[PDB]
Amino acid sequence: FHAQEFIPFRFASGGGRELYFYEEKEVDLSDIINTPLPRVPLDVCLKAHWLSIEGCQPAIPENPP
Amino acid sequence: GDPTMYEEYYSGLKHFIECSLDCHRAELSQLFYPLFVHMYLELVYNQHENEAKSFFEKFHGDQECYYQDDLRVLSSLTKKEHMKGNETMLDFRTSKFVLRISRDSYQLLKRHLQEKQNNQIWNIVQEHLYIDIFDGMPRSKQQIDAMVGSLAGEAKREANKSKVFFGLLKQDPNAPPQNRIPLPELKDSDKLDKIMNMKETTKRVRLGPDCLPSICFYTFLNAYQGLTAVDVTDDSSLIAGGFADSTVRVWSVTPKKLRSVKQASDLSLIDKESDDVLERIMDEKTASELKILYGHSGPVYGASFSPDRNYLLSSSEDGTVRLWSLQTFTCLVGYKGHNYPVWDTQFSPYGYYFVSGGHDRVARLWATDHYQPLRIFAGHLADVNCTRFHPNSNYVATGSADRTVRLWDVLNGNCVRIFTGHKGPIHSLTFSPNGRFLATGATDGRVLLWDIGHGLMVGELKGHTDTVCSLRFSRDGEILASGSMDNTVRLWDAIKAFEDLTATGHINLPENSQELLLGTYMTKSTPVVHLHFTRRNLVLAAGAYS
Amino acid sequence: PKDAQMMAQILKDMGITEYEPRVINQMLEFAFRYVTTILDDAKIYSSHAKKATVDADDVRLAIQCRADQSFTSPPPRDFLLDIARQRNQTPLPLIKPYSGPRLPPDRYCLTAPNYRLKSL
Amino acid sequence: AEKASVETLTEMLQSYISEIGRSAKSYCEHTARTQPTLSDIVVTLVEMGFNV
Amino acid sequence: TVPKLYRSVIEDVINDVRDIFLDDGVDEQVLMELKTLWENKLMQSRAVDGFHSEE
Amino acid sequence: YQLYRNTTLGNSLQESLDELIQSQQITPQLALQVLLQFDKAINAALAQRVRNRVNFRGSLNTYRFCDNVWTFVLNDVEFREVTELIKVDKVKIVACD
Amino acid sequence: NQVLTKKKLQDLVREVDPNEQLDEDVEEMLLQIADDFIESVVTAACQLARHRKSSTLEVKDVQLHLERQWNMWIPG
Amino acid sequence: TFLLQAPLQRRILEIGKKHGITELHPDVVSYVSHATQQRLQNLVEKISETAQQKNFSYKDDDRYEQASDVRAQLKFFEQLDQIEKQRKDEQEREILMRAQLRLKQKAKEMQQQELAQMRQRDANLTALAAQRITRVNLRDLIFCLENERETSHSLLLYKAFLK
Amino acid sequence: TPLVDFLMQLEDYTPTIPDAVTGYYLNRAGFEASDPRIIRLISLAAQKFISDIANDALQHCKMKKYTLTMEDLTPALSEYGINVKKPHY
């Protein structure tokens, strides 16, 4: 959608349109209400670990091995 | 100047250079790239679009491999009005390629151009190309490859001959002898900081090539808003995070929660004396291990602490630099000088001035007291990606996307050094604690070590694969730590790299990369965004695990 | 698709190896929005010149009158170097220096009593 | 309803909450404040043509 | 005979502090800014005429 | 004596070091060292830069002698030096030894 | 050469607010607004006259550029 | 605004030399004057509704409640920077000692201390001696430029950030 | 003042959009949840905008009910000055 007057929708985005090629192109309006909403994931936290102990990389689960 | 025959002028000089002897052939291959672009951009500016795309497809294939991202911006440019709004090829067409060549190879070049048989490619050379001549040996091909790659490349030696005060403040003859500004109005609380700083220096280990440091990675675990900026305070006490959801988040890493100071009603009742100085004002009702700062309308790209551990700085896509207090945990000032994304900011190491570089191809010098900047560093031809202060804060290094690093004097705003030799946009700069050296990293995975009193980039570290996004030297200067998008923290010997350190502008740098490696330290799917050195010489890194 | 497979070749010619699947869908949405505002203005310019066929000069007019307003650029180098030397040689007068929390004048800062409504 | 008509209208809904977010923050910070009052939104909604 | 003394003193002082500015790590441009800032305030006041003000 | 910083000459100078205070010469250090140089220079120039003498009269209001410096304030006082005739109804006189 | 005399601009403010004093940095840019705009109206209204193959600049050329690019709609 | 018809008619004709528009219609020089009026009246009304945005005092009303007064953080600055000045004075009291002979030196330095301070205070004194009229600042014009789609990314707003 | 008297009655009246979702898109733009009644007015002002379009697209569907289409949203937003686009892909 393109607004020629520009004022209700300025350069803020609406996140695009969730559309597909293999979509149904018609849904029932109570199917979208009755489905459960996805879980909001965990907020960002700061954990510290050790990449190197005096030159050697430890085999902790935060490291590749 | 017939356009119809630019594929006859360029292919004639291409035939002369490749038929030369091999000592002068590697040095005369430098003017393939600027003569290809200046002939192509002059075709598309005079609206010769049909015979410009045939000039491209003939001659863009015989270019160097490190120009591949430069030619694909030129393949899009076919019209005149496409180039009239690019502003990087508009400044490339008006500037002069510097093209440092030796006098032994320039005599063969001028004996092929002063004759009237060619007489038009010589006219393009003396119109669009500078030639800076040095008296010495012609450089090798793997030495020319080390110091080229920038538009307006290989700048003149007359730019790198100004006197630079690269010494530290308080003798130091190459540094302001008596002024030695020891921080604007060094306070008793700032003098109290250096008392506990030298207690940390007592436990500081000498790193060297034997006692390799321990790296403590501070990974951001969830981070589904993209982490774009990290900074750590000088004492390892706070860690800031700039994120793509337009937030700055301060974390305390010591076991001491982040407190705001009390409100003005609570401070007005605080009685005179009876201590009541720096602990009675801290509110315990507000005490978290995490404070979120809102107010940017865009992803926060720069993050910089002040050395007194107040005054967080942040810059973002919306074109503002913001000064967050760390005593009230609110925003104080919004510095609006750019209309464009400010890619980096940093406080001075004395904490009054700060420099911010943005998409508008300048870097501004601010002072936290004026709504307008003091110095505008406006010589780059692309985005100022990085902005770093010298340890004496008289000089500002600004890396950029046109593959040049430039030192700027804070007095007079003059560019005093131009460091070229990177193949991609510079994404990290750091200074040596001596002040004599400068390490720069870019998207080519190369860490180039530059001298500052000379300006010759003596060393080259080529271990990393992807964009080197974080560099730091040790607190002693013994080790340079490099972190890239290869998810590796490489450690380089920053003493054996500067052990040797003119009249020719180069030192014939070796392939010392294998000898200078001390470790590689692959990280679990985590790009190393920040590298920090604790005052007891412990490496801190922060990554946002993907 | 037809026009969506050409969009994956415009990105691959620009070296963009990795991209989201919604990137192609909204560059096509911008390319459709851009051509239905050139051609919409092209028949406005054709009706101004009173011709029943929208020919190539109408699209030449509608492109360069839309590119004069929509797609701007950063300021040029001769403009940036003039405001630099006007600023780098100007002595930037003076304000109030020592003020503990050192700051601009209070009408340029974000430090006001910052009121809110009484809950009742 | 049609499927493309629901993802259209919920895109105009997200773009509408994000526009009172950016503009009422801009109107309060123009008046040197950090958090917006009622008088900053009733001028924000006027500048979007809402008839509050 | 007064503007003369002032010029005389300004010249002597400026010349005599040059080395100090230099020893402190300063560009000669700053010195010239000083002279300009100095000369200008008198011209703005207009308590008497000066050679610098006329320029 | 940092006495002559209260002179047109001295203030114009400081206003210069204050434009540097905000842009380059942050606080004291450089600026202070320059002022120190100024003190020596102004003092030296005054004592040996020549001079011319005269004699005159006045009416008084206040006085202040401290740190060996006299500060007077005369009212309705006219002073004449050589040919020049002058009037004044309020003059402040600061005098060092 | 100046087309706006800086006093009739002050009467444009007195009609809106009998109480509105502009700044000298604002009046100097309110002139530059008119300066660049008179220039930008005629420079594209006289490509419309060249479009009609007519070298006379009738009022329909100036009126068309206001309605299509500026949305002003002042009648004849 | 109602632009003056005689200097405007010379103004249109000089820009017309660059395009070949040698004469102008007699209803145009009053149409551009009506077009310049509706340009500035649309801008005078726009800066008047933001010059009255600052003249709304919340503290007279008691439907509103105060939430965060940063400015009294200024009183905290007075307590702190002034406290720092007091410690600096303590440092000066330590300088006093260094600056029979010792006793004498204290008075010698006092001579060029308080008298010099008095001279400095006189220098400050001389330096110090040296209807709702809504006023539209350049901020109110800049605020109405970055919001509209035209002149949001323009060289006239970008230069206005430095004026 | 009616709108001040209206907002003081919003400690109750959960609106159609939740405040965890209206407050999410406000936090995305810097607007932080100081007062929860302030969120409910913004959630009400965004409901009324969408409801006024769906009530005017119904009048353009009765002339040609029971299905909202893009050719009903096209004349409904045309008086608003908003040209809606058909995906055509």
CSV table of N, CA, C and O in Angstrom, one decimal, chain B residues 42-86:
chain,number,residue,atom,x,y,z
B,42,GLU,N,34.7,8.7,-17.6
B,42,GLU,CA,34.7,9.8,-18.6
B,42,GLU,C,33.8,9.4,-19.8
B,42,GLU,O,33.2,10.3,-20.4
B,43,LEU,N,33.7,8.1,-20.1
B,43,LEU,CA,32.8,7.7,-21.2
B,43,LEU,C,31.3,7.9,-20.7
B,43,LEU,O,30.5,8.3,-21.5
B,44,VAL,N,31.0,7.5,-19.5
B,44,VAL,CA,29.6,7.5,-19.0
B,44,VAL,C,29.2,8.9,-18.6
B,44,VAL,O,28.0,9.2,-18.5
B,45,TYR,N,30.2,9.8,-18.4
B,45,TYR,CA,29.9,11.2,-18.1
B,45,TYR,C,29.6,12.0,-19.3
B,45,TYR,O,28.8,13.0,-19.3
B,46,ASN,N,30.2,11.6,-20.4
B,46,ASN,CA,30.0,12.3,-21.7
B,46,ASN,C,28.9,11.6,-22.5
B,46,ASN,O,28.8,11.8,-23.7
B,47,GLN,N,28.1,10.7,-21.9
B,47,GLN,CA,26.9,10.0,-22.4
B,47,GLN,C,27.3,9.2,-23.7
B,47,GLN,O,26.8,9.3,-24.8
B,48,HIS,N,28.3,8.3,-23.4
B,48,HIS,CA,28.8,7.3,-24.4
B,48,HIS,C,28.5,5.9,-23.9
B,48,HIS,O,29.4,5.1,-23.9
B,49,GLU,N,27.2,5.7,-23.5
B,49,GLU,CA,26.9,4.5,-22.8
B,49,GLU,C,27.1,3.2,-23.6
B,49,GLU,O,27.4,2.1,-23.0
B,50,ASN,N,26.9,3.2,-24.9
B,50,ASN,CA,27.1,2.0,-25.7
B,50,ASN,C,28.5,1.6,-25.8
B,50,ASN,O,28.9,0.4,-25.6
B,51,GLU,N,29.4,2.6,-26.0
B,51,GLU,CA,30.9,2.3,-26.1
B,51,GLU,C,31.5,2.4,-24.8
B,51,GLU,O,32.8,2.4,-24.7
B,52,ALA,N,30.8,2.5,-23.7
B,52,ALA,CA,31.4,2.4,-22.3
B,52,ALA,C,31.2,1.0,-21.8
B,52,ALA,O,32.1,0.5,-21.1
B,53,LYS,N,30.1,0.3,-22.1
B,53,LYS,CA,29.9,-1.1,-21.6
B,53,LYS,C,30.8,-2.1,-22.4
B,53,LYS,O,31.1,-3.1,-21.9
B,54,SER,N,31.2,-1.7,-23.6
B,54,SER,CA,32.1,-2.5,-24.3
B,54,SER,C,33.6,-2.3,-23.8
B,54,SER,O,34.4,-3.2,-23.8
B,55,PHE,N,33.8,-1.1,-23.3
B,55,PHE,CA,35.1,-0.8,-22.6
B,55,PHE,C,35.2,-1.5,-21.3
B,55,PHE,O,36.3,-1.9,-20.9
B,56,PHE,N,34.0,-1.7,-20.6
B,56,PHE,CA,34.0,-2.4,-19.3
B,56,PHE,C,34.3,-3.9,-19.6
B,56,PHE,O,35.2,-4.5,-19.0
B,57,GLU,N,33.5,-4.6,-20.4
B,57,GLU,CA,33.5,-6.0,-20.6
B,57,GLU,C,34.8,-6.5,-21.2
B,57,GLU,O,35.2,-7.7,-21.0
B,58,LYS,N,35.6,-5.6,-21.9
B,58,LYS,CA,36.9,-6.0,-22.4
B,58,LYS,C,37.9,-6.0,-21.3
B,58,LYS,O,38.7,-6.9,-21.3
B,59,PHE,N,37.9,-5.0,-20.5
B,59,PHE,CA,39.1,-4.7,-19.6
B,59,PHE,C,38.8,-4.9,-18.1
B,59,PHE,O,39.8,-4.7,-17.4
B,60,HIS,N,37.6,-5.2,-17.7
B,60,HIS,CA,37.4,-5.4,-16.3
B,60,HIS,C,37.9,-6.8,-15.8
B,60,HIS,O,38.1,-7.0,-14.6
B,61,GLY,N,38.2,-7.7,-16.8
B,61,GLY,CA,38.6,-9.0,-16.4
B,61,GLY,C,40.1,-9.1,-16.0
B,61,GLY,O,40.5,-9.9,-15.2
B,62,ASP,N,40.9,-8.2,-16.7
B,62,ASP,CA,42.3,-8.2,-16.4
B,62,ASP,C,42.6,-7.1,-15.3
B,62,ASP,O,43.5,-6.3,-15.5
B,63,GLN,N,41.9,-7.2,-14.2
B,63,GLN,CA,42.2,-6.4,-13.0
B,63,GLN,C,42.6,-7.3,-11.9
B,63,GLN,O,42.6,-8.5,-12.0
B,64,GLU,N,43.1,-6.7,-10.8
B,64,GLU,CA,43.5,-7.5,-9.6
B,64,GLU,C,42.3,-8.0,-8.9
B,64,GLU,O,41.2,-7.4,-8.9
B,65,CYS,N,42.5,-9.1,-8.2
B,65,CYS,CA,41.4,-9.8,-7.5
B,65,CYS,C,40.8,-9.0,-6.3
B,65,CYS,O,39.7,-9.3,-5.9
B,66,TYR,N,41.6,-8.1,-5.8
B,66,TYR,CA,41.1,-7.3,-4.6
B,66,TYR,C,40.4,-6.1,-5.1
B,66,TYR,O,40.1,-5.2,-4.2
B,67,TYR,N,40.1,-5.9,-6.4
B,67,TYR,CA,39.2,-4.8,-6.9
B,67,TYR,C,37.8,-5.3,-7.2
B,67,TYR,O,37.1,-4.6,-7.9
B,68,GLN,N,37.5,-6.6,-6.9
B,68,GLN,CA,36.3,-7.2,-7.4
B,68,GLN,C,35.0,-6.5,-6.8
B,68,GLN,O,34.0,-6.4,-7.5
B,69,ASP,N,35.0,-6.0,-5.6
B,69,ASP,CA,33.9,-5.3,-5.1
B,69,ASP,C,33.8,-3.8,-5.6
B,69,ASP,O,32.8,-3.2,-5.5
B,70,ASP,N,34.9,-3.4,-6.2
B,70,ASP,CA,35.0,-2.0,-6.7
B,70,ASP,C,34.4,-2.0,-8.2
B,70,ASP,O,33.9,-1.0,-8.6
B,71,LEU,N,34.6,-3.1,-8.9
B,71,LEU,CA,34.1,-3.1,-10.3
B,71,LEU,C,32.6,-3.3,-10.4
B,71,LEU,O,32.0,-2.9,-11.4
B,72,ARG,N,32.0,-4.0,-9.5
B,72,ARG,CA,30.6,-4.3,-9.5
B,72,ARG,C,29.8,-3.1,-9.2
B,72,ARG,O,28.6,-3.0,-9.5
B,73,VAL,N,30.3,-2.1,-8.5
B,73,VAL,CA,29.7,-0.8,-8.4
B,73,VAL,C,29.8,0.0,-9.8
B,73,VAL,O,28.9,0.8,-10.1
B,74,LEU,N,30.8,-0.3,-10.5
B,74,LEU,CA,31.0,0.4,-11.8
B,74,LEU,C,30.2,-0.3,-12.9
B,74,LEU,O,29.8,0.4,-13.9
B,75,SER,N,29.9,-1.6,-12.8
B,75,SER,CA,29.0,-2.3,-13.8
B,75,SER,C,27.6,-1.8,-13.7
B,75,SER,O,26.9,-1.8,-14.7
B,76,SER,N,27.1,-1.4,-12.5
B,76,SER,CA,25.8,-0.7,-12.4
B,76,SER,C,25.8,0.7,-13.0
B,76,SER,O,24.8,1.1,-13.6
B,77,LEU,N,26.9,1.4,-12.9
B,77,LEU,CA,27.0,2.8,-13.4
B,77,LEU,C,27.2,2.7,-14.9
B,77,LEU,O,28.2,2.3,-15.4
B,78,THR,N,26.1,3.0,-15.7
B,78,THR,CA,26.2,3.0,-17.1
B,78,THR,C,25.7,4.3,-17.7
B,78,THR,O,26.1,4.8,-18.7
B,79,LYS,N,24.8,5.0,-16.9
B,79,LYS,CA,24.3,6.3,-17.3
B,79,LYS,C,25.1,7.4,-16.7
B,79,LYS,O,25.9,7.2,-15.8
B,80,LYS,N,24.8,8.6,-17.1
B,80,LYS,CA,25.4,9.8,-16.5
B,80,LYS,C,24.7,10.2,-15.2
B,80,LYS,O,25.4,10.4,-14.2
B,81,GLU,N,23.4,10.2,-15.2
B,81,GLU,CA,22.6,10.6,-14.0
B,81,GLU,C,22.7,9.5,-12.9
B,81,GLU,O,22.4,9.8,-11.7
B,82,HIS,N,23.1,8.3,-13.2
B,82,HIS,CA,23.4,7.3,-12.2
B,82,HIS,C,24.6,7.7,-11.4
B,82,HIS,O,24.7,7.4,-10.2
B,83,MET,N,25.6,8.2,-12.1
B,83,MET,CA,26.9,8.6,-11.5
B,83,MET,C,26.8,10.0,-10.9
B,83,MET,O,27.6,10.3,-10.0
B,84,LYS,N,25.8,10.8,-11.3
B,84,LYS,CA,25.7,12.2,-10.8
B,84,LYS,C,25.1,12.2,-9.4
B,84,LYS,O,25.1,13.3,-8.7
B,85,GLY,N,24.6,11.1,-8.8
B,85,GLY,CA,24.2,11.0,-7.5
B,85,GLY,C,24.8,9.9,-6.7
B,85,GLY,O,24.3,9.4,-5.7
B,86,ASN,N,26.0,9.5,-7.1
B,86,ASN,CA,26.8,8.5,-6.4
B,86,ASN,C,27.7,9.0,-5.3
B,86,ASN,O,27.8,8.4,-4.2
